[PDB]
Amino acid sequence: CXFXLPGGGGVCXLXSECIX
Numbered sequence: 001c002x003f004x005l006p007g008g009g010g011v012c013x014l015x016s017e018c019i020x
Contacts, residue, residue, distance in 0.1 A: 003019055
């Protein structure tokens with residue numbers, strides 16, 4: 001979480017587009 005499968009700082013949905 002948020003929206004994005006990876007778990008770290010560089011993740012899918014990095015920022016308002018998804019997570020945020």
